[PDB]
Design a protein around this ligand. Structure first.
Ligand SMILES: Nc1ncnc2c1ncn2[C@@H]1O[C@H](COP(=O)(O)OP(=O)(O)NP(=O)(O)O)[C@@H](O)[C@H]1O
Ligand SMILES: [K+]
Ligand SMILES: [Mg+2]
Ligand SMILES: [Mg+2]
Lengths: 529, 88, 88
């Protein structure tokens, strides 16, 4: 298709217009007291929000060249949020500040290549100072504070998240799930869950709650089919003459097996249920031991899969609490053999963690965290489905932000961390005048988010910034400005803290996208229509 | 009434902002005034005595129709204080 | 300084008038305040003692130029109190 190319200063002017239009709408929502942004909904009432992430998601411009700058900053700002939770609005604010100041320096005749070198050097100094300012998380007190700040300053969400981390542990998984309840609740279950549920709905004990939990279950996992009448009747009759509650796990589902169990359930002879075949491939071996963690019996595998039945003293399979859903099942309790196969827990902690470098940790954690003590589910409740949507997304980000805080530490919030880090740029010196300009660009940018927060709350930004700078020497580095109430206090003591990962990623990502746009020389886009 | 009040507050609020007032401080004053007004409204209110006030409220709630007010007042009397009245 | 003061008075006066204040009474209040301010200024005044204050005043008025201040201080000393200084 025919394309139009824009060169040089004209190309950067288009990017500046797009970045400014995106940043101006987003930056007004920064802080705990951001201004409202109204978004049109087709054939419905308008949506009023202060999220910033919601505003950025709806931003798109007709001009392809202005859209280039908006989408480039949006993609980088989203990457900051994905890695460490919060930081979408802060990265956008920082990116605009660096880009606008960089263009002004270039317009005065400075070398763009030397400016980028000064920008890179300043960012490295700022990042190092951020690490020095950070402190490790102590316990539940800081975890609760981080979760509260990560959300819309909601204490109820922060308390729920902090409790979820306490119950789950330091290496589990916290899941945020759907609900229709009028209030948000925390659901914690011991053991591990399975990605699949009912094989047949006839097993349901009570249709109103649709639950068919089995007491003292004797589960039968099979690495072979073992689902015909010949394959099951000696297993069934041995179970029948033993009375053990029956759970059948096989390679696949059989119509013959379910038909006789539904008849048996109607007759009530045997406590039969099935969870088809969760997992794939070598994941079975982990699943084989997962039940062996709790029932204390050896895995059937294919050894007992052959001979049509487990003949030797194998697979006791004696649990005491198993849950079932439509596409979910949880094995909760049993006689227990956790310590014996804790060597495999040690093994995966020793082996699979060693091979994490291929970025397969998502598969390992999806196995290790389930194989851990237990998991917790966050239950979300709101007024409308639309109100339910952004609250669920906000809770997930708060959980991710809390995890990042534990990984790297916390820093004082409200933009104080960047202000303290920017103070070390005063002593940083270079032999090139243009590189010095890039250093001053970052110093000005680092002090921008604190002014924006003060401006949004209704205070003069430069007055607040001057007071915060003075309080760094008079009181301490952790002293800053609170935006919920217009007074200065110790942010760390007050609980207004941010993960140090969020601050570190936001400044690095913003400087990265701004640097590329500063040296951009051509924009290629198709001619519309 | 809500639409009339909303326009009055919005129009006067914009005039104050146009003169240089802080919008955040304007909202704080608006919130404080509303709390005082609501408290005074509760003080001014009186409990409903019986059928006389119920009939009057129903008449005013409709287009000042006495027939509708009488019918509604009778419906509350016959049904009771905790039932349901259906319009068909 | 006079222009800066004039803008400040007008801007603040507009805010007061926008709140419903009487413009005539605001002007009367402004006149009373200025009389107090002028009287306080006269009390704070200090008479000129000699060449030191003359040179300091000339230097400040010349945008911190010591060369101009020295020349003007010499000019006043030569012509005395009744002299006239011309700039060409
Ligand atoms: N009470 C407070 N006083 C001062 N600063 C605060 C306060 N609460 C939060 N902050 C700061 O405000 C910023 C968070 O505001 P927010 O608008 O969520 O920014 P973001 O996290 O970059 N955007 P999003 O990704 O949409 O959450 C952080 O820098 C917090 O430290
Ligand atoms: K906000
Ligand atoms: Mg946030
Ligand atoms: Mg009416």
């Amino acid at each position: 298709a025919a394309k139009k190319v824009i060169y040089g200063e004209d190309a950067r002017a288009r990017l500046k217009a797009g970045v400014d239009k995106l940043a101006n709408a987003v930056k007004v929502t920064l802080g705990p007291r951001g201004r409202e942004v109204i978004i049109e909904k087709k054939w419905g009432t308008p949506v009023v929000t202060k999220d910033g992430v919601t505003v950025a998601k709806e931003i798109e411009f007709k001009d392809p060249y202005e859209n280039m700058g908006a989408q480039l900053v949006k993609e980088v700002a989203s990457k900051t949020s994905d890695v460490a939770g919060d930081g979408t609005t802060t990265a956008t604010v920082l990116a605009q500040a660096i880009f606008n100041e960089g263009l002004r320096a270039i317009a005065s005749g400075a070398n763009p290549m030397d400016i980028k070198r000064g920008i890179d050097k300043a960012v490295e100094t700022v990042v190092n100072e951020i690490k020095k300012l950070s402190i490790p998380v102590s316990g539940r007190k800081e975890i609760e504070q981080v979760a509260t700040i990560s959300a819309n300053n909601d204490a109820t969400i922060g308390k729920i998240i902090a409790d979820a981390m306490e119950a789950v542990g330091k290496d589990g998984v916290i899941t945020v799930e759907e609900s229709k309840s009028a209030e948000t609740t925390l659901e914690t279950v011991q053991g591990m869950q399975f990605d699949r549920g009912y094989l047949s709905p006839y097993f349901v004990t009570n249709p109103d709650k649709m639950e068919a939990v089995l007491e003292d279950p004797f589960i039968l996992i099979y690495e072979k089919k073992i689902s015909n009448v010949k394959d099951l009747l000696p297993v069934l009759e041995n179970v029948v003459r033993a009375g053990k509650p029956l759970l059948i796990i096989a390679e696949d589902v059989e119509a013959e097996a379910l038909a006789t169990l539904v008849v048996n359930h109607i007759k009530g002879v045997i406590r039969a249920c099935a969870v088809k075949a969760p997992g794939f491939g070598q994941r079975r071996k982990d699943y084989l031991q997962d039940i062996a963690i709790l029932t204390g019996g050896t895995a059937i595998t294919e050894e007992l899969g052959i001979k049509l039945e487990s003949v030797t003293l194998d697979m006791l399979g004696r649990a005491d609490k198993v849950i079932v859903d439509k596409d979910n099942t949880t094995i909760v309790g049993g006689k227990g053999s956790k310590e014996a196969i804790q060597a495999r827990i040690e093994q995966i902690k020793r082996q699979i963690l060693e091979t994490t470098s291929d970025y397969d940790r998502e598969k390992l954690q999806e196995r290790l965290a389930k194989l851990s003590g237990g998991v917790a589910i966050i239950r979300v409740g709101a007024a409308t489905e639309a109100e339910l949507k952004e609250k669920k997304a906000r809770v997930e980000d708060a959980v991710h932000a809390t995890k990042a805080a534990v990984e790297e530490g916390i820093v004082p919030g409200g933009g104080v961390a960047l202000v303290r880090a920017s103070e070390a740029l005063d002593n940083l010196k270079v032999d090139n005048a243009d590189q010095q300009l890039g250093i001053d660009i970052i110093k000005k940018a680092c002090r921008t988010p604190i002014r924006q927060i003060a401006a949004n709350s209704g205070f003069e930004g430069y007055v607040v910034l001057e007071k915060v700078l003075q309080l760094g020497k008079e009181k301490g580095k952790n002293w800053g400005f609170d935006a919920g109430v217009g007074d200065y206090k110790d942010m760390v003591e007050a609980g207004i803290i941010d993960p140090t990962k969020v601050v570190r990623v936001a400044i690095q990502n913003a400087a990265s996208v701004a640097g590329t746009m500063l040296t951009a020389e051509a924009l290629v886009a198709e001619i519309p229509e």
